[PDB]
Amino acid sequence: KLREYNESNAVMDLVLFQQAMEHVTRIARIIDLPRGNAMLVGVGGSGKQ
Amino acid sequence: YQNQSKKLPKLRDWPAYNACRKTIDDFLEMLPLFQALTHKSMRERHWKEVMRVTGHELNLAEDHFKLQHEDIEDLTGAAVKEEIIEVKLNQLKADWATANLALAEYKNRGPVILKPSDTSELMEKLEESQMTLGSMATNRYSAPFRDEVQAWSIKLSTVSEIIEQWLMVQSMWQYMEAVFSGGDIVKQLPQEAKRFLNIDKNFMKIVSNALETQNVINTCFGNELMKNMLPHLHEQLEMCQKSLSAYL
Amino acid sequence: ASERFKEAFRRYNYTTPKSYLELISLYKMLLQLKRDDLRRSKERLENGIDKIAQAAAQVTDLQRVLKDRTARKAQMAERLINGLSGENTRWGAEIKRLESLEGRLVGDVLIASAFVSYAGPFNMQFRKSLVDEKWLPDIIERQIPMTQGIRPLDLLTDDATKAKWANEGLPTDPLSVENGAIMSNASRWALMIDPQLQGIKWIINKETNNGLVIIQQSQPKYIDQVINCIENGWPLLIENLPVDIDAVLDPVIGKMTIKKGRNIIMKIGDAEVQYDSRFRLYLQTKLSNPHFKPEVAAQTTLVNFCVTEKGLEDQLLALVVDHERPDLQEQAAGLVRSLNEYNITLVELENNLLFNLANATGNILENIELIEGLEETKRTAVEIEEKVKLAKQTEIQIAKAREVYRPVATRGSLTYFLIDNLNALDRVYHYSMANFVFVLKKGMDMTPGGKDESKVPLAERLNQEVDLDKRVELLVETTCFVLIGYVAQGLFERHKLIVATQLCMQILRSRGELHYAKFEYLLRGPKVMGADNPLHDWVSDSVWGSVQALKELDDYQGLPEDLIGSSKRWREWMELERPEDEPLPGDWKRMQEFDKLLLFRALRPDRLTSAMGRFVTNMLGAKYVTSQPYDLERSYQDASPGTPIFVFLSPGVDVAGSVEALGKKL
Amino acid sequence: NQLDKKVDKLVEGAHPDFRLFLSAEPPPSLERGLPISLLQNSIKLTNE
C-alpha cells in the first residue's frame, strides 16, 4: 500500500528505514487515543509528513 | 657474461674477432647504466644525465634497451651522492616521526613530569642530527634536501630551546611546589598562594599537552606550548621567591 | 561537519534526508550524463575503422596479385597504407581513453557529486578537510574505481570555460571558481552569500543578455514576472531574498522533495501546467550571515562567497601579477581560447579525409583525394602538441609569480583587511572597495620607483630603479603608503595614531604577535591593589598597585628589584620630571627590553603617548599623524570625475571661493 | 538617494572635464544622517 501514502498529504518523504517503521508502529499504538497528540519532536525537512 | 665466457677459448682472424671487442665494449659502460637504473637516482637528475651523456635516445619515458644502453661515470657519481644524502635524511625524518616522551610522575598527586626525558637525550638527538644537517649543508649533494634541513633545523632549534625554558620553568615551579605544597606556607602572603592553584593547574595542562603529544617535536609544538605561558609562569616563579627570602 | 562549523562559525546548517536523497539525485544525473557524452563521442573512429580495413584488404590483394608502372603503383600504395595506419592509431587510442574514463566514471563522479553537492556551505578549510581527508580516503578504503588525482572543480567546467568565467568577472581564488562550477550545475540553486557584489559582477558580465530580470521581494507582481520568466526562460535575479521570511517561493523554486532524482527541470516545458518555475533562477544575498529555519533551509541550498583574507589576497595578487607579468598572461589567454579552433581544424580535416574515404567506396589507388586529405590530416597533429606543454610551463610561471608577489600582496591585503574592519567607525573613514583598489593601483602603478619618473611629487619612490627587486621592496611600501595617505585625507589627527597603533599591532601579529598576556594587559586597566614596597616618590600610590599588578608579568615582574636598586632615578621620574628623548634611562628598558607598550601603561601616560608616536615613526617613518596639506589640485584631479569631489567642513571655513579659484587656476 | 542614484551612471558617463563639487558639515557620526555609499566613491578633504 506504499502508493496510498505516496498519494497522501504534502509529503516530507522517508521511504522505509527500520527506525522509521518502529516510530510508525509506536504511533499506530498511539493513534488509538483520545487527544491522540503524537508530537513527533525532531528536525524538519526529514520524515514527519 | 655467459656470452663472453665462451669467447675466451675461441681465437681466430680478427675481422671475425671484432665481436669480442664489441661485447667487452658493452660491459664497460654497462655498469654506469647499472647505476643509472638503480632507482636511488631520482629520474629528473637522470633526465639531466640523459641531456648530458647524449643518451637522448631515452627522452621517452620508455627506455627500451635498444635505447637504454666518459661523462656517464661522473654523473652516476652524482646520483650515488644523491642516494647518500637521501639515506642521510631518511632515518632523520623517520626517527623524528618516532619522537616520543618520558614523563616521570612527581611525588604528590602523581603528575607525570618529563624527567627521564629532559635528560640530554631529547636535546642531543636534536643537536648531533643538527650537526649532521650542517654537514650535509656543507655536503654538495643535499642541495634539494637543504630546505628540508632548514625547516627541520628550525623545528629542532625551537624544540630544544622550548625544552630548556620549560625545564627551567618546571624546576623553579617544582621548587615553589616544594615550598608551597600547602598548609602553613600560606599564613603570611595568601597573595602569592592564590596563584599557586591555577599555576599548578597550568602545570597539569602541560603534563597533558605532553601526555597526548607523544612526539617531542610536537610536544614542544604542542597545544599551548606554541603559546608562551611559560614566560608568564617564569615571572611568577621569580617574583614570589625573593619575597619569601625577605620574610625569611 | 555542520556541528563543529556552527559551534565554530555562528552560521547554521541543518541536515535532512532530503539532502542524502539530493546527493543520490545529483550523482545519478552526472553519471548518466557522462555515460551519454562518452557514447556520443565514441562512434566516430569506430565507423572509419571498417572502411580502413576494407581498403587495406583491397590493396593487399593488389600486392599478392603482383607476384616500372608497378613501382609507382607501389609508392602510392606505401604512402596510402602508412597514412591509413597513422590515422586509425589515434582512433583506437581515443576510444580506449573513452573506455578507461568509463571505468573510472563511477567513483570519480561519486567524488564530484559529494564535492559539488555539499562543499558549498563551508569554508575552504572545511571543504578540504571533509573531502580530501574523509571521503577520498574512504573511496581508497572501499576502492571504487576512480582516478585519485581528482579535482572535481575541473569536472563541471573547463579552463577555457573558466577562462571566460574569470573574463566575465569570476574572481580568481579557488573559492569563486568552485562556486561558479556549483551554480553551473546547481539543482536547488544555492543561496549566493555575496556581501561584496563580486558574484553579482560575474553574473551580470556573464549571464545577462538572455534578459536578466533583476528584482526583489517587494510586490505581488513578483509572482507574475516569475510566470513571465516561466513563459520566457528568463534569468530572474534575486537580490538578498533573506531580507524577510516568505511562504510562497518554496513550491516555486524549491525542487521540493527528492528520492533518487532523475527528474529535474530548468526551463520551459510542455507537460508543465502549474507554472511554478520554467527558467534558471539567480539569487544574490548581500547579507554575509543569513539565518533560516531547519524546515526553511531544508528545501533549498547555499554556497559561501564572503571575501576572506586569502580570497582578497588572491584577487589582488592576480591583479599585481598580470599587471607586472602581462606577457605570459596574454600568451596563456590567447592559446587557451584558440585551442578550440586548433582542435576543430585537425578533427575536421580528419573528417574531410573520412569523407574522401566515403567517396572511395570502390577505389583506392584511384580515389587519390585520400592521399591529399591524408597528408594534412597527418601533420595537423603537430598543431596541438606544443600548445599543452607551453600552457604547463606558463602555468608554472604563473604559480611562480603568485608566490613572488604573495608576500607583497599579502602585506597590502593585510592592510586592506585592516581598513575594512576599521570602517566600523563610520564617517572618519568610508571609502569604496573600488576606490580602495584605485588607491591600490595608485600605490603599485603610479609608483615613480616602479617607473623611472624622478620628476614627480614622489621622491620616496626609487625614481631611478625600474629593476623588479627594487620594485618589489619599494612598491610593497608604496601601496600601503599611498593607502594610509589617502585614508588620512578623510582622517582626523585625533585618531591617526589610533590607526598607527593597531597598524603596528597587526603588522607584528602578521610577523609574530603581542601575546594576550602582554596585549590583554595593554588593554585591560593597569591597576591592582597598592604595594607599599614603592616608597614613595618612586611610584605613586595608585601606581603602587599598577606596579604590583605588573610585578606578575614574566617580562615585568622584576620591578621592585629595580625600585630598590635605582630608587634615586625612580623617585626622580614620578616626581613629575619629563625628559622625552630618553625619558627614563634605558637601564631598565634593557633589563626588560619590554614590548614598547606595557611599562608606562602601569607608569607614565604622557611619555607613553610620545612613545607610541616615536615607535610608529620608527616603523613607519615620521609621517603618520602629521596633518593633511589641504590640497586643491592634485589629490582631487589625480582621481576621476566618477569619484566626485566632496569635503568635510570644520566650523568657520569655506572652500567655495577656494573651489572657484581652483577652477580659475585650471 | 535622489542625486547619487543618478551619479552612479551619469558621472561614469560624464564628459571627462566634469568636476562636481560637494560640501557638507558632517552631523554626529551615529545620530541621524547620510548613507555610506555616498562617500564610498567620492573625493574628500579634512579642514582645521
C557 and B235 within 8 Å at the Cβ level: the answer is yes
**What DSSP state is assigned to residue C285?**
B
Distance from CA of C240 to the nearest CA of D (A): 17
* Closest chain B residue to the Cα of C551, Cα to Cα: B239
A13 and C14 within 8 Å at the Cβ level: the answer is no
Q: What angle do helix axes C17-66 and C69-118 make, rounded to 10 degrees?
A: 170
The Cα–Cα gap between B137 and D20 comes to 65
Q: What ranges make up the beta strands (E) of chain B? A: 104-105, 112-113
| Residue C193 main-chain phi, psi, to 5 deg | -80, 95
User: What letter represents residue C51's amino acid?
Assistant: K
Is there a contact between C321 and C398 (Cβ–Cβ < 8 Å)?
A: yes
Cβ contacts of C520 within 8 Å, gap of 6 or more:
none
The Cα–Cα gap between C531 and C561 comes to 13
The Cα–Cα gap between B51 and B33 comes to 15
State how far Cα D16 lies from the chain centre.
18
* Closest chain B residue to the Cα of C528, Cα to Cα: B191
| Residue D15 main-chain phi, psi, to 5 deg | -60, 135
**What DSSP state is assigned to residue C153?**
G
Is there a contact between C87 and C389 (Cβ–Cβ < 8 Å)?
A: no
Cβ contacts of C320 within 8 Å, gap of 6 or more:
C405, C408, C409, C444
C16 and A11 within 8 Å at the Cβ level: the answer is no
Residue C448 CB: number of other CB atoms within 10 A? 20
Is A41's Cβ below 8 Å from some Cβ in C?
no
Is residue C348 helix, strand or coil?
A: helix
> Which residue in C553, C558, C561 is closest to B232 by CB distance?
C553
Is there a contact between C560 and C578 (Cβ–Cβ < 8 Å)?
A: no
Distance from CA of C516 to the nearest CA of B (A): 10
C-alpha cell recorded at residue C197: 557584489
Q: What is the resolution of this structure in A?
A: 7.5
C655 and D23 within 8 Å at the Cβ level: the answer is yes
State how far Cα C225 lies from the chain centre.
34
Distance from CA of A43 to the nearest CA of C (A): 7
Q: Which of B203, B218, B217, B204 is nearest to B171 (CA)?
A: B203
Give the pairing type, strands C236-239 and C282-284: parallel
C-alpha cell recorded at residue B162: 622550548
Taking a contact as any Cβ pair under 8 Å apart, which residues of chain C between 310 and 339 contact chain D?
A: none
Give the up-direction half-sphere exposure of residue C362: CA atoms within 13 A in the CB hemisphere: 1
Q: Which of C413, C409, C614, C420 is nearest to C501 (CA)?
A: C614
Q: Which of C566, C524, C572 is nearest to C549 (CA)?
A: C524
C-alpha cell recorded at residue C621: 617613518
- Our answer on whether B and A touch (3+ beta-carbon pairs < 8 Å) is no
Q: Which residues of C touch D13 (CB under 8 A)?
A: none
The Cα–Cα gap between C393 and C25 comes to 39
The Cα–Cα gap between C320 and C549 comes to 49
Give the up-direction half-sphere exposure of residue C409: CA atoms within 13 A in the CB hemisphere: 24
The Cα–Cα gap between C194 and C201 comes to 10
Q: Which of C608, C586, C613 is nearest to C597 (CA)?
A: C608
C628 and D36 within 8 Å at the Cβ level: the answer is no
Which of B165, B235, B238 to mutate to test binding with chain C, by most C CBs within 10 Å of its CB?
Answer: B235
Burial of residue B238 (number of CB atoms within 10 Å: 0-12, 13-18, 19+): middle
Is there a contact between C450 and C473 (Cβ–Cβ < 8 Å)?
A: no
C557 and B228 within 8 Å at the Cβ level: the answer is no
User: What letter represents residue C517's amino acid?
Assistant: A
Q: Which residues pair with B105 in a beta bridge?
A: B112
> Which residue in C515, C517, C557 is closest to B238 by CB distance?
C557
> What distance, in Å, lies between the first and last C-alpha atoms of chain A?
16
Is there a contact between B238 and C560 (Cβ–Cβ < 8 Å)?
A: no
The Cα–Cα gap between C223 and C214 comes to 13
Cβ contacts of C391 within 8 Å, gap of 6 or more:
C332, C335, C336
Residue B175 CB: number of other CB atoms within 10 A? 12
Is there a contact between C336 and C391 (Cβ–Cβ < 8 Å)?
A: yes
> Which residue in C17, C297, C298 is closest to A14 by CB distance?
C17
- Our answer on whether D and B touch (3+ beta-carbon pairs < 8 Å) is no
Q: What is each CA distance from B226 to B130, B158, B162, B221, B234, in whole angstroms?
A: 21, 10, 9, 5, 16
Is there a contact between B111 and B203 (Cβ–Cβ < 8 Å)?
A: yes
The Cα–Cα gap between B156 and B125 comes to 9
> Which residue in A15, A44, A47 is closest to C294 by CB distance?
A44
Q: What angle do helix axes B43-52 and B71-97 make, rounded to 10 degrees?
A: 170
DSSP assignment of D16-48? TT---B--B----SSSS---HHHHHTSB-----
Alpha-carbon Rg of chain A, whole angstroms?
11
Residue C521 CB: number of other CB atoms within 10 A? 23
Q: Which residues pair with C304 in a beta bridge?
A: C193
Is A9's Cβ below 8 Å from some Cβ in C?
no
Q: Which residues pair with C302 in a beta bridge?
A: C191
The Cα–Cα gap between D26 and D10 comes to 25
Dihedral of CA atoms C197, C203, C209, C211 in degrees, nearest 10, equals: -80
Is there a contact between C177 and C166 (Cβ–Cβ < 8 Å)?
A: yes
| Residue C212 main-chain phi, psi, to 5 deg | -100, 95
C-alpha cell recorded at residue D2: 535622489
- Our answer on whether C and D touch (3+ beta-carbon pairs < 8 Å) is yes
The Cα–Cα gap between C431 and C639 comes to 13
User: What letter represents residue A39's amino acid?
Assistant: M
Cβ contacts of C434 within 8 Å, gap of 6 or more:
D40, D41
Give the 3-state DSSP-derived string for B146-204, with helices as H, strands as E and coil as C: HHHHHHHHHHHHHHHHHHHHHHHHHHHHHHHHCCCCCHHHHCCCHHHHHHHHHHHHHHH
Residue C225 CB: number of other CB atoms within 10 A? 15
| Residue B24 main-chain phi, psi, to 5 deg | -70, -25
* Closest chain A residue to the Cα of C293, Cα to Cα: A44
A44 and C15 within 8 Å at the Cβ level: the answer is no
Is residue B41 helix, strand or coil?
A: coil
The Cα–Cα gap between C100 and C111 comes to 17
Instruction: Cell 599588578: give the residue.
Output: C549
Is there a contact between C287 and C192 (Cβ–Cβ < 8 Å)?
A: no
Cβ contacts of C568 within 8 Å, gap of 6 or more:
none
Q: Which of B137, B139, B99 is nearest to B219 (CA)?
A: B99
Cβ contacts of C419 within 8 Å, gap of 6 or more:
C429, C431, C436, C483, C487
DSSP assignment of C452-481? ---SSS--SS-SS---HHHHHHHHHHHHHH
Experimental technique used to determine this entry: cryo-EM
Distance from CA of D10 to the nearest CA of C (A): 8
Residue B97 CB: number of other CB atoms within 10 A? 10
The Cα–Cα gap between B130 and B217 comes to 14
| Residue C304 main-chain phi, psi, to 5 deg | -75, 140
